[PDB]
């Protein structure tokens, strides 16, 4: 890809009608606190520009809408991972109001508050919520 322009190239490669970029999918299919691609894809994104579109890439459908990579970071317990995302220009004011994050017993979604600060709070992640408020620039 570094031989190519990468701009539309990877924006077309993400899964149709779901907005699943390489970083989001890397965190759902990780294991025991690592995938070995999540640093790597961010290494690709700091040499090849447009990292800010990658970390802040959220789903497109109205059923997973707004769930950035950071929501998956908090939830899956890897407190060291979420350090890298906020460092690497990831959004923390991301609003995930799809339909899995509303109040409906059809498709029984889990409502956490539509802010990653509230996901950690509702998840028994107190060391992480403390980190969300003393984290670097953002």
């Amino acid at each position: 890809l570094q031989k190519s322009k990468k701009h539309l190239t990877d924006n077309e490669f993400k899964d149709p009608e779901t907005g699943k970029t390489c970083l989001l999918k890397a965190m759902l299919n990780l294991h025991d606190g690592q995938n070995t691609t999540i640093p790597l894809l961010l290494e690709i994104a700091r040499q090849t520009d447009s990292l800010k579109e990658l970390v802040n890439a959220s789903y497109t459908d109205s059923y997973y809408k707004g769930q950035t990579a950071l929501h998956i970071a908090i939830e899956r317990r890897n407190m060291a991972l979420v350090t890298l995302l906020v460092e690497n220009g990831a959004d923390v004011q991301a609003a995930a109001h799809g339909d899995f994050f509303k109040k409906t017993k059809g498709r029984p979604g889990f409502y956490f508050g539509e802010l990653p600060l509230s996901l950690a709070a509702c998840t028994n992640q107190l060391g992480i919520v403390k980190f969300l408020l003393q984290n670097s620039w953002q």
Binding site: E75, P108, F110, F112, L119, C122
Partner: protein
């Protein structure tokens, strides 16, 4: 070697025999429910391509429907809530997990022969039970 398919004069395999021996006590339920796992592990470890619970006896009753009919509730609780967590013994898991976000998780129980098998479904064998089947109402 011992043939794990323990067909006898009455037709009861080892799993059948382990249903017929139960008593719905705590010491016995704690025991027999465990033993199925290792017999099932070993049946999947030493003789694959033969799931052992579909086998029947002379009267034509699976160990599932033999526990449904003979009043074995803790035995039946195991075989229905069976959740084996290890590869190459996992197809025999009866209670799967289709997802788990935070505390929420969608258990994915199988309706193999609870309803609509060619004979002796668990609901039939409980509902269409005679009168003195112990624990019938529980």
């Amino acid at each position: 070697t011992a043939d794990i398919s323990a067909r006898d004069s009455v037709g009861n395999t080892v799993l059948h025999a382990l249903v017929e021996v139960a008593d719905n006590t705590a010491d016995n339920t704690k025991f027999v429910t465990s033993m199925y796992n290792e017999i099932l592990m070993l049946g999947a470890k030493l003789h694959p391509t033969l799931k052992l619970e579909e086998l029947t006896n002379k009267k034509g009753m699976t160990p599932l429907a033999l526990a449904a009919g003979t009043g074995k509730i803790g035995v039946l609780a195991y075989i229905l809530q069976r959740e084996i967590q290890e590869p190459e013994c996992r197809h025999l898991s009866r209670k799967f997990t289709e997802w788990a976000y935070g505390p929420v998780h969608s258990s994915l129980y199988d309706l193999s022969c609870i309803d609509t098998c060619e004979k002796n479904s668990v609901l039939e064998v409980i509902a269409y039970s005679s009168s003195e089947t112990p624990n019938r109402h529980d």
